[model samples]
Target chain A: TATSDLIESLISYSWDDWQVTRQEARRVIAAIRNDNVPDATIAALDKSGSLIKLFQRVGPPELARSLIASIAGRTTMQRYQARNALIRSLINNPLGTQTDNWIYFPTITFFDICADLADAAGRLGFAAAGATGVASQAIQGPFSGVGATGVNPTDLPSIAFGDQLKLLNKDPATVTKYSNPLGDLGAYLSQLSPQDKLNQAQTLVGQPISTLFPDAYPGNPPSRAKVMSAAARKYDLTPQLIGAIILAEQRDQTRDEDAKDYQAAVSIKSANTSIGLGQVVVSTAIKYELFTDLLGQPVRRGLSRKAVATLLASDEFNIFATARYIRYVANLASQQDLRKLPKTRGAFPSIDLRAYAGNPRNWPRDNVRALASEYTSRPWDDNLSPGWPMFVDDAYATFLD
Target chain B: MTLTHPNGLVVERPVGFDARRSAEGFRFDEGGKLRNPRQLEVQRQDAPPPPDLASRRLGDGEARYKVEEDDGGSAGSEYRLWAAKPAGARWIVVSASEQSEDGEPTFALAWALLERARLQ
Candidate 1:
């Protein structure tokens, strides 16, 4: 009688998109449940590996899908191939049934997933037996916990698939562990915004911020202020102006590139490459011997190309070296005409700026108009290079503004 | 505990560093009023070297000096230090910092602190 009840229970299980007649399912479960099971049903079960066919004829399709999902790989199955191989093993033998049947290993391991889903469905008030219109109960179910037929919600145990499924929609901060069918819920919750996910994670587990969101939280970056100011002070401008220039020059440098390819590019270019916060072209940095000693010869200038490159990559040295360049230009401009330069306080290019901007030798004046326009369009006094201060000023405005 | 200095600048010191060491103090803009904040450090020959300061020959004697920005940015803060070995003693160094808004005042305070410092 208990076996018949068990057989009938399987016959009444819920399914979506797959059809299974109660009569066939009952017959198959009955034959399997009996002490001396029917040879026809055993042969049927053992002969086919089609899960859809096996479950439609015997095991519950809901249980079938859940168990299939638990399997390691290759989910897609044709109608004939849909036979439930694992359920067959369970039907063919007792819970203690021992045979050299190694095919049952995975089936046995994942048997809990099927049982859990079935229990969950039952908790949602799905009829166990004797219902012609039981599918409608599945419709009115889930939230109230009470069955649509007015069964008490408390009658069902709280540990069912329906309960676990509902738990996913609840606050993630409250859930400690996700059951088998809900194993991926935690990672899914992590896709939320960092702050929201962090709040949830803080309540879920009291680990460090980086532990939960390492990608989002990069702990304090290194500071090279001492060296940066020293480098800035080496010239007339304050570290602020240098810092702004560094931000402007290196804005494009920090853009995302394929990390592996970027590393390779860095290696080949060395310090000569336009790199770091200041985006000091390596050739130029070397040419000036800019970092030739921290604040002076106090620190030796034994910096290797790699070392200089590394230094330039950091915000401090990058800004420092850039400031040195601007000062070098200013120094060069100082030797020239001071009256012609309007904003001499700011590190305008002048000769040094022009030299750094590009090679003046390469470009042809491109007829008289280009040369004439350059001559007439000077912004400050009569000097052609006064625009260099505008460039520096523009950088300050862009970055600091 | 927050300390109000003679220069009318008030500072909050971190407990971990303050409990064991009295060599350094940081500046803060309390009540969001001070736009700039800086730090001050007093060093002795026995004290550890200040961050990134290098040893070099100044005049007839070895001196230790360095200047650093607040790793934050140019709009942040800056620190500068210059100290020499005393006539008979091993060494002593003093450094001070200022917010970007008050650079010279910070320098003057640091100079005053250096002159006023009483060494053993």
Candidate 2:
């Protein structure tokens, strides 16, 4: 029916969560009737600053929550009741087609949000009726990317969840198949004799790095093996992967400047994106809704001071969060796909190498190679592709077991 | 009989001596009593004797007092006197909540008379 379709399109109160008793509707109706009706009619009303005032009410932002809940459930029964109540309201106060030019409202955007709600519910496998209950599981409101099904590559969305890159198998040609732009292996080995690198690798498992020193800075030049060992034990990744990412990002912190190298390794490649050392984009911070409420607020198209603050203050937790984000993206890709070569998606490349002081592609492959070769203490299989630069020993050793 | 509204009005009268007018002195209605100050007249060539004063009809039965020739002010001057009835009159005094500005002069009396019917 046109009335039902229009009700679905225009009214937003259907789901059980949005249900309001007749008594509740009567209260608002009664308030309007009781408060000097002549002045209260739509034709006579003045609501210029009222919108901001409405949101400023300190209580739980109940109105906004109610609006979201109602819109999200528009196809259900409550929406019909809400629409009927609204029609009754219009009878007492009808100011036809109020194009007053002075009034501003969020009605259009809210409608758009209602439409987006339906899309999210469909992708999450809800019966159109049951979708609204599950929709609230998201931290972001209705406009989020597709559902994050831990197994499927098709379901994962770009910014929030994770990326998919296969080519992770330990097959005969896998070692040759993978490409390491940064010569990680040669560089790490150059710094230490092969015997020394091997000695450090052998000892790293048991002698964990004690960052628990009262001073926050991990003890100066703490042996790579000790640091890797502690990180691996606590985080379940291999010592080698940890060393490699650190070497790629901060380079043992031997110099004052290499602090952000790892961060830059992961930032977004989008032209509009602000890149932090750990590749934590301001967009990611906004997506996560960091300290400021200005999340998802458009980046000013150019590097602005506010954008710079977002990147510079990208906390260590944020970097870890970003790494976890990438891992989650990988997890979304099928296990077989992980071993495959990494490919750029859409017009935008996934990783921003420029965030590091040096370009990630330009980094000597030897540095990455060292971690890939040493990642697992397991006997060498010429088939194994050392996942350096991207998947080094420290990654396997420090975090992922 | 019981009365709720007070009978008084507030009258703001300008009181300065004027040398030019035949009547140039001012008078005030202070607490229902009227008083005037004598002034030297520069217009009169001979030393003037204290002159007779006049009372003009205000509103209702109320009247205003006037006197002439005050030497106290600058060269040219005139003083205008004002009054109000004493019954059914209300004046803006400091509001009741206020602690100060009490007992000041007001036209509450003249305005009070204006409220009554003609001597009835």
Candidate 3:
């Protein structure tokens, strides 16, 4: 009947930034005209057999779906079944709603998702990037980091680790100033796979919150099963680590049902930190190195909804994603060998970021460092750092509860 | 960073949710229909900034109240404050008030930015 030019334009694009192959173009045209296209569109586009080149240019969900539908083979269930699935998937994703004209365009629909995809690809590069071990004055670069400023461990700075990451760019010479502080991050993440890492982190589960938690562990611990398990699954960390972190943050999730509870659990007098899972504080968890590695690279925050949804949709994936993130932090903190780090100075020790219930100033640095070193570092060793075992939900609270 | 001042509280809901749904929810613009595109856009612009950035919640196909207080209130600022007891045991008080460039102590926006002390 009527020509599907709109569909054709979409089909002709939606691909990698390369020249379109002859065969792909032909099939793309056929599918738009046929209406009885198959499901093979997924594989075709995935392998570069279809109009991926064309779709790349179109750069939107509308074009991507149209191309997907155009090339797929008819399924046993029915014609355009694969296409329907694609549409369903697009709709199911929260980004679908966000995909609507956020950008100014002849290029509305695909604009968001395209940037989203590119960012994911960029994050995938972090592991390799950090491995290079070129020190910067920035958090990412090198030994330019100023770890444990107040006293080794006991009185570390607030955003020490995260601040050091900034060193690479602000002062590359600083990174070069120090000779391989400890090592690189890649070595540490490689130390444990996702599953094993979970196990390692789990060791702290239900163990009296954290040593950092007020009156650490003398009281009956709060319920780690409910919160820690959920958070562990949601954040991709182990239950114990999540528990430890929660313990540290909320003092074993103690209820502020009454004024006393509030003061004991949430008051600065007691825990002296923020609240909730991940110890998000007044701040929510933003992108970390793992956001790049697991999700893909060149990551951007807020605007990259699709990539975030994709990574966060699955807990296990997100947890490993987080682990790699901490690993990346550790990667940057170490002396380049994962196992060894510079004893002379810590990884991060300058910026002031308050994120935990006990000692807000050094919370992020301590937690991140703990995650990097797998928590072998002492929580009470004056570094005031919690280590890897503290990454879980209740680690911060049980001890206080 | 501590959520002590009234400006620390911030709410991330539909642009004019209070104006539209005070009786059923919280009224924002009692007489005016601020739900139009222009108004909504303004809502986005006027929302608070990070680390307590405005964000839409990921729903499980159901709507429920969520109160996220991360700061340690152990010091006793919450003693007299009236808050709803959430199913999750969160600490937050919700109500509707007027909307404007300046904040209304009774308004949702004021409570969000001034009271909540949102960092995340």
| Docking quality (DockQ) for each candidate | 0.01, 0.00, 0.01
Candidate 3 per-residue C-alpha lDDT over A1-401 given as tens digits, one digit per residue, 9 for 90 to 100: 12233333434534564444545545554554354332343333433433323444333444443343223212223223333434445432434223332221212232323333223322322111111111112232211111100011111223345434543244444322221222222344355465543432332232222111111111222222333344334334444444343223222122211112112222232322222222221111233433443222333344233333222222222333433333333333332332233331253443222232222223554454344223222112222122223233223333223
Query: Model 1: runs farther than 4 Å from truth?
Result: A1-230, A257-271, A295-301, A337-392, A398-401, B1-120
- Using lDDT as the measure, name the better of candidate 1 and candidate 2: 1
Best by TM-score: 1
Segments of candidate 2 deviating more than 4 angstroms: A1-185, A194-244, A252-315, A335-391, A394-401, B1-120
lDDT of 1 by residue, A1-401 (tens): 33333443454436663445656554543344342323333343334333334443434433333323322111112211322455454564423211121112233333422233223222322212221222112212111111112122112233445534543344333221220111122233334454542232122112111110011111221123333344544554555455434422222121221111113223433312344444354445666876543223322244445544444443334555666665655444335554554343233322332332232232222211111111112112222322222323333343233
Q: What is the lDDT of residue A338 in candidate 3?
A: 24
On residues B12-35, what C-alpha lDDT tens digit does candidate 1 reach at each position? 343322312343323321121111
lDDT of 3: 0.29
Instruction: Go through the candidates in order and give each one's C-alpha lDDT.
Output: 0.34, 0.26, 0.29
Model 3 error, position A98 (Å):
3.4
RMSD of 2: 37.6
Q: For candidate 3, lDDT tens digit of each residue in B6-81?
A: 3232344444333332211222332222110111101111222324323333222211232322211111111111
True contacts kept of each: 0.00, 0.00, 0.00
TM-score of each: 0.25, 0.21, 0.24
